[PDB]
Amino acid sequence: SKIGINGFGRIGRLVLRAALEMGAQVVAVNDPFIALEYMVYMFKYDSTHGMFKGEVKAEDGALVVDGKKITVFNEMKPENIPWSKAGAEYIVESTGVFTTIEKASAHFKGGAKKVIISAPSADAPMFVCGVNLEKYSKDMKVVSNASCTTNCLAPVAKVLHENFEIVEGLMTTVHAVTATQKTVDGPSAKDWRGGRGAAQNIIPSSTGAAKAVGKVIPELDGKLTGMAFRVPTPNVSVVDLTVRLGKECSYDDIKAAMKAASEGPLQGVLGYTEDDVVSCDFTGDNRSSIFDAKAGIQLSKTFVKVVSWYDNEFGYSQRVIDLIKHMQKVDSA
Amino acid sequence: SKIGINGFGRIGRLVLRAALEMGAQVVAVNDPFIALEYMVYMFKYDSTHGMFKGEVKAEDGALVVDGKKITVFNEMKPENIPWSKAGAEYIVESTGVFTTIEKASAHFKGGAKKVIISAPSADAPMFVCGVNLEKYSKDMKVVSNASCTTNCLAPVAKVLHENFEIVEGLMTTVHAVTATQKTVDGPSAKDWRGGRGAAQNIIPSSTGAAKAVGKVIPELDGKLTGMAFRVPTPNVSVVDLTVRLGKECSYDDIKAAMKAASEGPLQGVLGYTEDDVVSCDFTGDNRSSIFDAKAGIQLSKTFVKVVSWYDNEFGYSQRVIDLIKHMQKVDSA
Amino acid sequence: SKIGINGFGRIGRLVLRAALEMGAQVVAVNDPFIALEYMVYMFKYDSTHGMFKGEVKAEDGALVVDGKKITVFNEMKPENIPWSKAGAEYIVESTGVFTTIEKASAHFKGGAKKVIISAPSADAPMFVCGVNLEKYSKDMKVVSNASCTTNCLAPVAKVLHENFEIVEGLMTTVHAVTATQKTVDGPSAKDWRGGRGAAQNIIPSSTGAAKAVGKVIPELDGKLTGMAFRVPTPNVSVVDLTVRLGKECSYDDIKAAMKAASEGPLQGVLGYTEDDVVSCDFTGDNRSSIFDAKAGIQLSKTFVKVVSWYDNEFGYSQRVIDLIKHMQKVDSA
Amino acid sequence: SKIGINGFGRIGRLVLRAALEMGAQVVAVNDPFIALEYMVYMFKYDSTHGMFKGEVKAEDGALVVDGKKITVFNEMKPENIPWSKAGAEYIVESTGVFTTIEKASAHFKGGAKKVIISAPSADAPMFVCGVNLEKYSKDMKVVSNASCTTNCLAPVAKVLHENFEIVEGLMTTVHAVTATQKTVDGPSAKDWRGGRGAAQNIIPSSTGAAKAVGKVIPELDGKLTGMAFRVPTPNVSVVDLTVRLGKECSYDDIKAAMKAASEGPLQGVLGYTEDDVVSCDFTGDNRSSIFDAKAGIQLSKTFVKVVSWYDNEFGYSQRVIDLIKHMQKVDSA
User: Fold this and answer.
1) Closest CA to C233 of C182, C177, C185
2) What's the CATH code of the domain at D225?
3) Which run of H or E residues covers position B156?
4) Is the C-alpha dihedral spanning A249, A254, A255, A257 positive or negative?
5) DSSP assignment letter at C175
6) Residue C262 annotated as binding site
7) Is residue B189 located within the same domain as residue B288?
8) Is C65 in the same domain as C137?
9) What is the CATH number of the domain that holds A42?
């Protein structure tokens, strides 16, 4: 699908695993810091998701994954990456720093057609698969796939709001550790709690996730907000949404509405389970949000707490490829 | 004080540490399973709270801690413990098994004057220090000190209800691992999620805490309920309380009300901080509930989330001694 | 291959995964404690090794795994398990308690032909695949597959001794946590260090592994001994063998000898790598021992330290099926 | 004492804590990256060693700890720190970057009298308190305090060599995580294993410790070498030393020799225990090396394994202050 990836960090590298897994075609990778023999090692071994089953080798200055030759570039500034040379047209911008339309637009100088920011953007239209893809029009040059917690929250909020109306809600995500955290207490000037030892601590943290759902589902703007607790697990997180509903209902109506949407309009985005699951059961899960039927609780006919799991690395990687596929189809119709 | 302790598990051992920290007097300990020389070792060394500072030895069938002799019994059945033989009068029943009035009364067959269940009871009146100690009357022979999460929830629920009226609240506690969990996946018949590998997993779980607050503050009965997530930390937990309030207010009004209560009627039970704290900052904290001012969020003038920390092992042990000291005052008044 | 498994704990349950994976046929499972709906859950979800990809259901009092109907029994005493009724002939005895020939022999009363103890036996001949299988003769009714650390140590010691002669050696295994450990400091009367919180601690522990290599390779009897440090990882362990050799050599002769044996007589038992591997890279590995070329060190021409990884759960499960296959072939020739 | 500290990372902060614990006087701290109000916070709160007991505030551009004013500089280059301005004379250079005599000499441009590198040095004479302090002469202007693992190895190597003669030794340290590791898999160009997820993994690593002992005890030069395994614990490490000895002996002779040295010439540096200890029992331990008597094993009268614990953050910080106090005595003698 002429995909180029900028950044070979955790998201770039798993977006590449996802593409391979989904039959997609990545033709170029850019990273200023990882050299090609290091790229091979990093792609091949993964402590959370297992060793890549397939051949990964460096051959003539290209990364070669199961025969697929991927051109590698090591440019510092996006404007200088020669995307056109590899034939990379739609590029996943995963560095975390070129996230606004102006900045992401620097990929057009090297011949990119469209840029997909895999992070919240302050101004590029944000998409969540299964919720607002019909808003995408081929004239959008730079889009964003929002965050992995927005991709978990927005499914479950779409179903709750369509059927019972969300009057207001407050969310907590119990989130696995990330790369921005510290093995032992270290400096983190912009977030003091975030520099404290990640394996030792439950750490309060912020999240713009519930805010961003107000952008993906405009009717929920200003009705949701939340926070995060980082806890010592390597991956897979859980949204805990407490919501005041507009229409009286039972918990079995909430379970029935969620099962119905996982079977139809949100098939493959929203999952449904009634088992005694814990977080390791969703390592490698491709869905954006998996509603846990037995964990939620209802205090009253309009006040309830809903629980939804997400593999914060893997489901979001798979959604980046889904948004590119949707985009391509819309741009060639 | 003439305290006796039944059970030498984490609660029993740490109530012995708290007594010694607080000048209270423990004269006998019973455990059917832990022999005297193993008691010396388990009390002396503690992975979370550290080595006991002071001398701990077994001398003539007694446990001697800083010169104090503690008679040791190894009886399976309460009715068989010779409490009067050791001069033990106020028994902390900490095994978790004899929690109703009918079952805890077996201690009177051995000469006990009062029994304090250090766990929730289906029927013994439950106390939270700072919230309802004035309900205690000297004719109550069996009382309960409720649980560590109720001791964290109830102070915060009391200030919120007094000042703004709680209409409805749903609670989550992000809870450190406990002795009932498993190092690797194994059998837990009653609670299948609870048998899954504790260091690997975020584990949904139940909590009666929120329900128990309706017992302690009768006007919150049926207005509150909640759940727990067990996460891989050895100690210290956090209550995440989402509440709809009767009176409109700002978050600064909630902060002011908590600060004031921690300086006055709840001094020593409820703490207040505005620092960038994490859970390891509360290891060894003696207070029942520390309101984290900076972590809460308010969505509207009546819908807010409040975060309060607690060292689930240690604040609770100290409260058991405070409950016994209150009781001995009323009983000899 | 008419296999019956006694015990549905971690080894029993992964021996069943291994059998399915290897085309073997298990016709019965016995466990007194796990009921069939709990067996389905436990087999299906695994925090370390992933969800079973396949259908697992209870159907008419049988566990049915991908069409394979497995009869379940819930007997407390091995003598009473009716193995003959399901046609279970070779039974994997994995409970950890019926480990001597007399005790394991209790399976013959229910019609078992041969018993394979998946633990060290004090008296049943111990086998390690790739090292002493030719010692097996069809008249042996009860054999043992030794332990997962013996299955890692014995390969690597066979190669070192055949080529350079082991004069003496001392081993340390840095071992992942096991089921006998405790989430927080708890009682463990027979091993006080072993009751201390597993996620918090490096814990010295014993191991009979090096002793048992003296039984599998009789020429090394009395020349090896060692110990274990339990550390907070859920699976995959590493042997660190420090050895005084009889013949002068270089580290490159040790690497060459190990590569040669992994390519021929020890193919599939002993692996060889020169990558920058860490323990998660061997989760799911089927080999008994994987020699790490870059981690070992040589001080002198006869004194060296060798490093070998093993997935202490998975490789040993796969070897139990390999020993049964070898046995069957030898018993029907 | 007039101590200055360069760097406010884990070693810098804990050397400030140790000085205050020991009555020593620190008059200035430099860190280019950590601002004064963030210094207050990082010093006050500590996940492993706990909250500082005492008042810590920023007052007029100074860090005031228990009434003591500490002038703060934020200079990138040593030559630019105005050490004489604050009356700082003995500088603990703890950044890890200025470790040779040529690089550490940049501190004299600012008025320093002596520089103590709190890390190994390629050329500054290295000291281990208790082993070779008598080699210090007042003309040495730049010295090194070696590393925390050398401070654990060298006392134990000294008793073993004095009494039985070390012919050959290979060491492994099972080492807690450090600040150079990663919460999740990421880039570590120089050391690929060291970038893999620290809480997930046992990680082979290098150590110069054993080589450095040949510098500190010149007769062990070239007789020792070793490696490290980084494991998921926040602090406290253990040396596993396998040694061939010149003189035949029993393990009881090694125990007796260690016990005697800890009562006499190594009192305070080497500790001795015979309890069932685990690593959390040594958090905050001030000693450099605690011999665990019960964990070692002896194969033959000349081949034994010795286990010694150390709190890699804390014993080392205390030794830096002991080295400075020795130096100030000799310099004013």
Assistant:
1) C177
2) 3.30.360.10
3) helix B148-164
4) positive
5) E
6) no
7) yes
8) yes
9) 3.40.50.720
If asked whether residues C191 and C295 sit together in one domain, one would say yes
Which positions of B are annotated as active-site residues?
A: 148
Q: Which residues 40-69 of D have a C-beta within 8 angstroms of B?
A: 41, 45, 47-48, 50-51
Q: How many whole angstroms separate alpha carbon D121 and alpha carbon D127?
A: 11
Count Cβ atoms below 10 Å from residue D307 Cβ, excluding itself.
22
Q: Is B38 on the interface with D (CB under 8 A)?
A: no
d(CA D178, CA D140): 31
- The count of residues in chain A is 333
Q: Is the CA virtual torsion C66, C68, C74, C76 positive or negative?
A: negative
Residue contact A229–B240, C-beta within 8 A: yes
CA–CA distance, A135 with D264 (Å, rounded to integer): 79
Active site residue A148: yes
Q: What whole-number distance in Å separates Cα of residue C258 and Cα of residue C290?
A: 10
* C200-233 burial: b if 16+ Cβ within 10 Å, else e: bbbbbbebbbbbbbbbbbeebeebbbbbbbbbbb
Q: CA-CA distance, B296 to B307, in Å (whole number)?
A: 6
D314 contacts on B by Cβ (under 8 Å): none
Give the distance between the most distant pair of CA atoms in chain D: 65
C280:A47 CB<8 A: yes
C141 plus C158 within the same structural domain: no
Most C-contacting residue of A40, A44, A45 (CB-CB within 10 A), to test interface: A45
Q: Is B310 helix (H, G, I), strand (E, B) or coil?
A: strand
Q: Which range of residues forms the domain containing residue A86? A: 1-146+313-332
Which secondary-structure segment (H or E) carries B103?
Answer: helix B101-104
Structure tokens, C30: 């016995």
In the DSSP assignment, the letter for residue D280 is G
C252 Cβ partners below 8 Å, 6+ apart? none
Documented resolution in Å: 2.0
Handedness of CA B135, B138, B141, B144 (dihedral sign): positive
Q: Do D174 and C225 touch (CB under 8 A)?
A: no
Q: How many residues does chain B have?
A: 333
CA C237-C243-C248 angle, to 5 degrees, is 135
Gap between the terminal Cα atoms of chain A: 15
Q: Which amino acid is at D275?
A: D
**Pair C126, C263 in one domain:** no
Burial class (CB in 10 A: 0-12, 13-18, 19+), A173: buried
Q: Is B75 on the interface with D (CB under 8 A)?
A: no
C310 vs C291: CA distance, rounded Å: 9
Residue C280 · residue D196 · CB < 8 Å: yes
Q: Give every CB contact of residue D300 below 8 A, 6+ residues apart in sequence.
A: C168
* N- to C-terminal Cα separation, chain B: 15
Paired tokens of B333: 């008044």
**B183 Cα to chain C: minimum distance (Å):** 6
What are the chain C neighbours of A51 within 8 Å (beta carbons)? 281
In a shared domain, residues A212 and A137 = no
Residues C154 and C98 in one domain: no
- Label the pairing between strands A224-231 and A237-245: unpaired
Three-state SS for C84?
helix
The reply to whether A106 and A244 lie within a common domain is no
Question: Are residues A51 and C276, on separate chains, in Cβ contact within 8 Å?
Answer: no
Q: Residue D143, CB half-sphere, CA atoms under 13 Å: how many?
A: 24
Which residue type occupies A278?
A: V
Subunit contact B275:D45, Cβ cutoff 8 A? yes
C180 CB-near residues (< 8 Å, 6+ apart): C188, C194
A-C CB pairs within 8 A amount to 28
d(CA D257, CA D272): 10
| Count of structural domains, chain A | 2
Residue of D202, D227, D297 with shortest CB distance to C279: D202
Torsion angles phi and psi, residue C38, rounded to 5: -80, -40
